[PDB]
Amino acid sequence: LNLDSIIGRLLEVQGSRPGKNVQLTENEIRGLCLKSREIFLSQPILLELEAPLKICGDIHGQYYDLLRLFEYGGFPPESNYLFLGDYVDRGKQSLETICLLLAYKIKYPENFFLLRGNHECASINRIYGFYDECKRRYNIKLWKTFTDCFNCLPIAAIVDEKIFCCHGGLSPDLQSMEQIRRIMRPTDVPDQGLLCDLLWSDPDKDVQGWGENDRGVSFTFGAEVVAKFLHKHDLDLICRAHQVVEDGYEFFAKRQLVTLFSAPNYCGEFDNAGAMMSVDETLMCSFQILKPA
Amino acid sequence: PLGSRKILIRFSDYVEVADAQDYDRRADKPWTRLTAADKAAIRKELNEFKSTEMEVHELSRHLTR
Ligand SMILES: [Cl-]
Ligand SMILES: [Mn+2]
Ligand SMILES: [Mn+2]
């Protein structure tokens, strides 16, 4: 795998006017999928990470915004990164986005990590853009190759035994972390149950306990569910993504949960900032914002 | 190990703010061109795809209610 060449071509478009494509060969992309999949399967499904670390939320194929976030935080290996999922769909350049993220996972496998979002599953990204982008620029078989790779992404991470990270949220069925660790990969994301909830659930300030979810999938959870979960597992913070928030980050339940969304001006339809959370080695957490002007 | 029962996290009073690039992020919305018959076909395509070629461990859901 000519990995350095691939990263060079992906980064070559930094000085370009947004929208310039990077058309790697199909075989290079398959190589990124195959080698990253092997690494995902060799590492835990519940990651145990240590700070310093940069944590990013949704990207949704906004590749030129991803390039600016790395400029902001330092390109690997200058900084360590945990991404909370939703690399593809909705944006103009999902293929460049996932290829750069997969290439950096292969290049720096102990310092660069990707979680699974709800858009990293066949049923969702068949519809919301990634399949169409694969088919237009390559072929359907390549989308199936990505699906196999996505089916092996890890599901959650714990930073410094204190920050629980996943894409969506909590689950009424999540009593022990061991329940996450026993999940075998590759796996699809079912339309209900523990793995679905980790990728799909939402906090809600108006709900007591567990409520129905307006997406028609999973649940909402209230502030006391978060507090009880943090206390039982000796955790300090839940870090999740999954929802567009005006400032790029948004606290819930007296800063016991934070939502991160890293795609500014999302889809060209929202006026939102994108944010990353930087965790230094003393567990001081700070927010870096990319705001529309 | 780094765990403990004491609260260790802190949040900084400073927030770093920088400007996003000014570009057109509007993208094509192919799913808006799908009819009902289109969606029905795709559901069957996905069904066949998962039933016959997507490798997994036949994972699925638990329930008790
Ligand atoms: Cl596994
Ligand atoms: Mn989402
Ligand atoms: Mn969304």
Author numbering:
A (entry chain A): 7 to 57, 60, 60A, 60B, 61 to 299
B (entry chain C): 512 to 576
What does the paper say about this structure?
The three Protein Phosphatase 1 (PP1) isoforms regulate diverse cellular processes, acting in partnership with over 200 different PP1-interacting proteins (PIPs). We show that efficient catalysis requires interactions between conserved hydrophobic residues in the substrate and a novel Phactr1-PP1 composite surface, which comprises a hydrophobic pocket and associated amphipathic cavity with a surrounding basic rim.
We determined the structures of purified Phactr1(507-580)/PP1α(7-300) (1.9 Å) and Phactr1(516-580)/PP1α(7-300) (1.94 Å), which crystallised at pH 8.5 and pH 5.25, respectively, and exhibit differing conformations of Phactr1 residues C-terminal to residue 567. In both structures, the PP1 catalytic site contains two presumed manganese ions and a phosphate anion, as previously reported, and its conformation is virtually identical to that seen in other PP1 complexes, such as spinophilin/PP1 (RMSD 0.23 Å over 255 Cα atoms). In contrast, at pH 5.25 Phactr1 C-terminal sequences adopted a distinct and poorly resolved conformation, perhaps induced by protonation of the three C-terminal histidines.
